Design a protein around this ligand. Sequence first.
Ligand SMILES: CCCCCCCCCCCCCCCCCC(=O)OC[C@H](COP(=O)([O-])OCC(O)COP(=O)([O-])OC[C@@H](COC(=O)CCCCCCCCCCCCCCCCC)OC(=O)CCCCCCCCCCCCCCCCC)OC(=O)CCCCCCCCCCCCCCCCC
Ligand SMILES: CCCCCCCCCCCCCCCCCC(=O)OC[C@H](COP(=O)([O-])OCC(O)COP(=O)([O-])OC[C@@H](COC(=O)CCCCCCCCCCCCCCCCC)OC(=O)CCCCCCCCCCCCCCCCC)OC(=O)CCCCCCCCCCCCCCCCC
Ligand SMILES: CCCCCCCCCCCCCCCCCC(=O)OC[C@H](COP(=O)([O-])OCC(O)COP(=O)([O-])OC[C@@H](COC(=O)CCCCCCCCCCCCCCCCC)OC(=O)CCCCCCCCCCCCCCCCC)OC(=O)CCCCCCCCCCCCCCCCC
Ligand SMILES: CCCCCCCCCCCCCCCCCC(=O)O[C@@H](COC(=O)CCCCCCCCCCCCCCC)COP(=O)(O)OCC[N+](C)(C)C
Ligand SMILES: CCCCCCCCCCCCCCCCCC(=O)O[C@@H](COC(=O)CCCCCCCCCCCCCCC)COP(=O)(O)OCC[N+](C)(C)C
Ligand SMILES: CCCCCCCCCCCCCCCCCC(=O)O[C@@H](COC(=O)CCCCCCCCCCCCCCC)COP(=O)(O)OCC[N+](C)(C)C
Ligand SMILES: CCCCCCCCCCCCCCCCCCCC(=O)O[C@H](COC(=O)CCCCCCCCCCCCCC)COP(=O)(O)OCCN
Lengths: 82, 111, 80, 375, 47, 145, 61, 61, 205
Amino acid sequence: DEPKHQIPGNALDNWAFLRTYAKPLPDMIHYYYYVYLFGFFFVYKVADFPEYSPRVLVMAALIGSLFYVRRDWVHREFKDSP
Amino acid sequence: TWPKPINPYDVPSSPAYHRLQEPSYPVIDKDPDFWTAVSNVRKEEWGTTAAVAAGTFVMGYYLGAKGHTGKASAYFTSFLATKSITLYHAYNSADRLMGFKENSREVVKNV
Amino acid sequence: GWEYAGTYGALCGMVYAIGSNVISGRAWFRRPWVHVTSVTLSYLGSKLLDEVQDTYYLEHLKRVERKGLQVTEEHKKLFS
Amino acid sequence: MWENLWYLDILINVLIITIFGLISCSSSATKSYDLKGCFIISMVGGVYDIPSAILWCLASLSILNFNGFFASLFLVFTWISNLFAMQSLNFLGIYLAFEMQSLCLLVLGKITANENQRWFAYRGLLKYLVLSLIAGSIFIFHASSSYLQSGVMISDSLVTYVFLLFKLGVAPFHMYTLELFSVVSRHVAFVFSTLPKLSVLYLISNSNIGSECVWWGLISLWLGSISQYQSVFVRSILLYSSVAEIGLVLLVLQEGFSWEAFSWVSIYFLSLSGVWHANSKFVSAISVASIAGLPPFLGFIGKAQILKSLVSINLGILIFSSILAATISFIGYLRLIRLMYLVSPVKWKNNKDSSFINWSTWMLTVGTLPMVYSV
Amino acid sequence: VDSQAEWYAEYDKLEKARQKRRIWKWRDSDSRDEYAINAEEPVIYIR
Amino acid sequence: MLLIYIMLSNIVVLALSVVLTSSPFMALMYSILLYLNVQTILWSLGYDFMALIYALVYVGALAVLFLFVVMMVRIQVSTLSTKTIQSVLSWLAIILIFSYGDVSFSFPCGAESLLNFGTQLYSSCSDLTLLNSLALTIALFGSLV
Amino acid sequence: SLLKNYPPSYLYPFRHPKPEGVIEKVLFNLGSLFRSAGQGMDELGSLMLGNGGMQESVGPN
Amino acid sequence: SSANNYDLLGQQHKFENSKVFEEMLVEEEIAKDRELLEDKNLAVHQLYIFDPQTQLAARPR
Amino acid sequence: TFNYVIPYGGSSSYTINNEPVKAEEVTVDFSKEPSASSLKLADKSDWIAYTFNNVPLMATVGLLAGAHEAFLHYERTPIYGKRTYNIIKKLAPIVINKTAYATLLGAIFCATDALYENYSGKKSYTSGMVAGAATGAVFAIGRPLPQPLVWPLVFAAAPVIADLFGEVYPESMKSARGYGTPYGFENLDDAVPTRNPIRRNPHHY
Ligand SMILES: CCCCCCCCCCCCCCCCCC(=O)OC[C@H](COP(=O)([O-])OCC(O)COP(=O)([O-])OC[C@@H](COC(=O)CCCCCCCCCCCCCCCCC)OC(=O)CCCCCCCCCCCCCCCCC)OC(=O)CCCCCCCCCCCCCCCCC
Ligand SMILES: CCCCCCCCCCCCCCCCCC(=O)OC[C@H](COP(=O)([O-])OCC(O)COP(=O)([O-])OC[C@@H](COC(=O)CCCCCCCCCCCCCCCCC)OC(=O)CCCCCCCCCCCCCCCCC)OC(=O)CCCCCCCCCCCCCCCCC
Ligand SMILES: CCCCCCCCCCCCCCCCCC(=O)OC[C@H](COP(=O)([O-])OCC(O)COP(=O)([O-])OC[C@@H](COC(=O)CCCCCCCCCCCCCCCCC)OC(=O)CCCCCCCCCCCCCCCCC)OC(=O)CCCCCCCCCCCCCCCCC
Ligand SMILES: CCCCCCCCCCCCCCCCCC(=O)O[C@@H](COC(=O)CCCCCCCCCCCCCCC)COP(=O)(O)OCC[N+](C)(C)C
Ligand SMILES: CCCCCCCCCCCCCCCCCC(=O)O[C@@H](COC(=O)CCCCCCCCCCCCCCC)COP(=O)(O)OCC[N+](C)(C)C
Ligand SMILES: CCCCCCCCCCCCCCCCCC(=O)O[C@@H](COC(=O)CCCCCCCCCCCCCCC)COP(=O)(O)OCC[N+](C)(C)C
Ligand SMILES: CCCCCCCCCCCCCCCCCCCC(=O)O[C@H](COC(=O)CCCCCCCCCCCCCC)COP(=O)(O)OCCN
């Protein structure tokens, strides 16, 4: 026997939490189609955007990084309800 | 305006590819034929053609033998390589006749 | 260009023969014919590479002179 | 008529080899080495410059590992499309060459899948097709508007830049590569993640197709690096590495550094060959190290050319991003090294078909000192 | 062992390499379309 | 002028019908009617052979291929009708947004000639005709296997 | 079998039939030269290898 | 059961060992071509269907 | 120096100056100058004007994030099953709230930056630090313990990173050329160019 790290939580509760990821999985093509379409239009529009200060650009990148939600996060928490 | 009349039999046409260059050297033949170009190919080029043909015969036989068809591969490879090198040599000789490339030997040999 | 291209190439051919033997689990001395072939081919390839590099160095010197870089005789000496 | 002959020779050569292979089709020679050699000789008739000679080298190396007459013919078709892409002078040449290459990818992917692998391969091919159709349709619609407004078809436009961005697979147009290349054969993924790039880089450099915007390469560099670090599967690590690098290369190529991108593509090809055609742990380790950019291998020279180009343009944000993203990528490559020699006993199939793999590993090790002049 | 000669030879070799590098680093655009920057270059286009 | 306008306006209704219908067989039928309307638009711009080409390649051959595939893969897609009023107006809004205020140019009429088109295709523009033939060969070889 | 045109090399891999072509005859004679030179070199190497010379023979049944 | 099993084993081993060299080589080529022909997208597969035990063309496809 | 007796490096005279010598006889510039739009947006004189000019960027980023999350929710919902609830009513708050929060944070950052620069009267790193700190304070209003310290730091650091590598870096390394003779050392005998290399034409996309 050897010293081991203590695992927070009960075994069945952790397994139940892990089981909330086992949900119908959409195909990634649906997301990709929209991202490709809007991305092409976005690239066309970007050429006409006004020149922004580097500081403003960096701040916008920070805000976007903070506000980005990982696909797994929505997947785990999605509920088909009002 | 008025439509220009067109002669169906003589409609202006041109080849797809054009070399944009004025002849630096004298023009022995403005429009050489295939046979004229072949007749002007240098002896060294013909030696290169024969060396390539022999080498490709040997390589073709070697590769063909692994598939039990050595003779057929050797002849096909020889023919294919000889044809491609000969077309390259004829293109070079035609360019020399047209004056695009150096033609010192060519002008002397056929005045 | 490089004055040690021939030696380097021969040693690299040795590197090829030994490495190929070692990767396949054979000892370095196995397949002696491979060693001579590799050494000769690598030596020739290294030499050829050096001429190619020199040729493109001279082409570049010609181009820069045409553009207007006032290269001196010593600079024209740097590119063999 | 003589200029036309140069182009005509390639067609005559391809047709005669095609009909010879069809006539001489037998079980006795499933691996038509003779035809492979004829195809290689034929592709020497299209070498006109150094980039064409690199296209020939890469196509020949790719042809060596394809099995059967059919696959090699479709690689020759890919080579013809790539050669025509470099020479394209207007919208029609670009569209025609790239869509022919897309067709060759669809066929090569389809004909290298087993019956048990059809469910995932055909899905990935279909997703690639539909995304390609979106890209091509938006390209041709904008090209039509540009042709109407200007009266002429000029390859210096935003429309072509965005299209070639899709073809390179930078910014948000990299998902087709991930979906398709994950489900296809290792050789097909390797040859179509390297060879196509050279043609696009040549087109961009020669036709002045550059933009002032650095967002797309910055995005590709960061997304690729972070996604490489978070990816469990090893195919995704390799696929995202190409996204990150081609993003950085795109940034370098916009600023006029053509020589460095043409040297990078060749080193990247040689580095990727051994990791993708995995047979030996050592070859794969040396490949991963070269992709990573470790100094004893040729991969260091390739990365060095790009980094050296970056310091000349003197853009601070790019340099900072590059350093951090490279570190993140390095963690993924360390993961790959850990998986092979530090996790569990590894047993791989004895696929003893290392055509150019030993040569590539040798060229990676040995090539650093000869090519030191560049950097 | 003439140390002075060796030092001067090594310095000269490094200086020549630096000069050759700087000459090499002078590179105009090689684009086929960019005829203006490369007007003096002798090129033939088959198109 | 009324006929040209009607054809131009109709092409939109015939394109909307394809996406809205829930039956794959019916969508092809609407696409066939769209292709014919495109032939009639081409007739108003002065092209006769080009409009013939569209009908031959698409109506004559491509539609047959689509029907063959649809019959072989036949699925039950009459599950439910989801054409809520909210969805249709949102779609028509997206369409209107995209198709608004673009640069417009006066309608042209241009007489075309096959003699010139054939001459150019087989002389000055021979490079395109052969690359297209190679593309067809690539498709033939890949589809048949 | 369906086909009777199979290459002789395919049908008899262990020993090819007697050479009939000029090229095949030349290859045969070259092979004879290579075999004899190789046996000579083998014997020379066996001398350097010393007592026994790493010789091998068929074993009795 | 042990005796009967070893009798069957003996029969199998006798069968494998008794084949002559020419047959063993031919079988090695059969096995190699079985490995090469595992890919079903080859052009030759479209032409003919091969016999499983000996990879010889059996019928046209 | 590579010795242990004297200090390494060197000393340059402050009294003696070297007259500037042009890199080349004729200078052709392929780098375009800043646009009038860039200068207009960069003008921080009037805080309200500055804020309203620069918020479009934050609004766009918020809209992209909200569209992403809304799509993720929409994709999962099943078309085949009829849903009692209205999907748009569920999805519209996501997008609206994300856009509003992003715009509010960017407004705070731009306002504080302009107000500090006006009050101080000087363009300085501190203005970015105080704008970032205020934005991070607003972000962490109700968050647990570590976040109040971490967000004001990360947000304050971001304008520092932007200033160092977007403004100071290029101006600091403007002189370096790479061709001809090293910037400082023109006495050395290196090939002298008639014209500067033009590696690319001025961009237009
Ligand atoms: C209606 C359709 C719906 C789509 C809506 C719009 C459609 C697209 C239209 C136009 C699209 C073009 C532009 C959109 C963004 C470009 C990305 C893209 O399109 O790729 C395709 C992408 C999917 O591609 P994929 O390959 O399949 O997915 C790969 C991922 O692994 C996906 O797997 P994953 O999601 O599970 O994993 C996510 C992973 C993926 O990683 C990334 O997202 C990498 C991106 C990082 C930065 C990107 C470059 C930034 C440069 C921007 C350039 C402009 C500014 C210029 C100067 C800025 C200098 C940096 O990141 C994370 O783990 C989450 C963290 C988020 C960022 C991580 C960085 C955190 C730093 C903050 C520090 C604070 C922490 C301190 C405390 C920590 C305590 C220790 O599609 C999208 O995501 C589009 C959604 C649009 C939302 C973007 C939000 C803001 C957009 C602009 C802000 C720029 C930052 C980017 C943030 C996130 C972007 C992903
Ligand atoms: C560096 C910086 C980087 C910059 C640029 C880098 C450059 C980039 C590119 C550079 C590339 C370098 C890396 C790639 C290396 C290439 C790969 C490679 O090494 O070979 C692969 C390849 C791999 O062989 P493998 O691993 O056994 O697998 C093949 C299988 O057997 C498969 O079997 P198979 O069915 O395919 O069989 C076909 C093939 C493969 O078959 C074989 O390999 C079986 C073995 C061949 C017979 C043994 C060779 C006989 C003499 C070799 C000398 C060894 C000396 C060592 C011991 C001394 C003995 C006294 O048969 C051949 O050998 C074809 C060649 C014809 C020659 C055969 C011998 C002719 C009689 C001898 C000629 C003259 C005798 C003079 C002196 C004789 C004694 C010294 O090796 C060869 O094919 C050998 C090629 C030639 C054999 C040696 C001929 C040398 C001439 C005799 C020495 C006289 C001095 C030489 C100078 C003058 C020449 C006449
Ligand atoms: C023997 C003499 C060789 C010495 C010099 C070679 C030149 C004469 C060619 C003579 C042939 C020898 C081949 C060597 C070079 C290949 C080049 C070439 O051939 O064309 C160039 C030559 C003229 O082009 P050019 O000299 O490049 O100059 C044009 C402008 O300057 C514009 O072109 P540019 O791009 O060179 O412009 C200058 C460039 C500056 O560019 C350079 O500095 C180039 C640097 C040289 C690097 C060499 C490596 C390239 C890899 C290709 C390997 C060669 C494959 C051979 C393919 C052809 C085989 C014959 O500046 C740039 O910034 C552009 C970027 C260039 C790319 C960046 C360079 C990096 C490359 C990747 C390196 C990365 C390392 C990876 C691994 C390294 C490990 C050590 O074309 C010809 O003379 C006619 C072509 C005829 C070829 C085949 C025709 C004969 C047979 C006809 C029928 C065939 C069918 C029958 C088959 C017969 C056999 C069975
Ligand atoms: C040395 C000068 C002359 C050499 C004689 C060759 C001249 C013949 C004309 C060219 C024919 C091809 C040259 C042979 C090279 C490769 C041939 C080959 O593949 O060898 C064997 C098998 O493959 C090998 O063994 C590999 C050998 C590699 C090459 C070794 C030979 C080295 C010298 C030959 C070529 C040198 C130059 C040729 C002339 C320039 C072929 O097998 P099969 O198709 O079954 O033919 C055998 C005939 N029969 C069984 C019926 C008796
Ligand atoms: C200055 C050089 C440095 C710059 C680098 C670029 C320039 C390249 C210079 C050298 C190129 C060398 C390329 C090395 C290729 C390695 C050879 C090879 O791949 O052979 C294959 C060939 O495989 C084939 O498919 C053969 C088909 C064609 C054979 C060769 C075609 C020859 C055509 C003519 C080429 C001449 C060039 C034409 C004019 C230039 C054999 O391997 P396998 O049998 O499939 O498996 C090996 C198994 N194991 C190692 C584990 C034992
Ligand atoms: C990778 C390329 C893809 C795209 C390639 C596009 C570029 C190739 C386009 C050309 C396709 C082939 C068309 C012929 C090519 C060269 C032209 C030619 O040789 O025809 C001769 C015709 O000249 C001849 O020599 C007649 C005999 C020709 C015999 C065969 C040569 C051409 C063979 C073409 C191969 C097709 C045959 C079947 C394909 C296997 C020149 O035409 P004219 O000069 O106008 O006619 C002669 C009149 N006069 C000389 C008096 C001015
Ligand atoms: C990688 C750099 C990122 C900074 C890392 C610091 C640790 C992160 C913690 C977050 C804290 C926010 C960032 C603060 C760092 C700035 C240093 C504060 C010094 C300071 O306040 O002086 C300012 C100038 O310093 C400056 O703004 C310029 C100093 C440059 C920052 C330090 C550069 C080296 C740090 C790298 C250390 C290790 C790297 C690993 C991260 C004012 O100047 P003023 O002109 O306004 O005068 C006033 C007239 N009103």
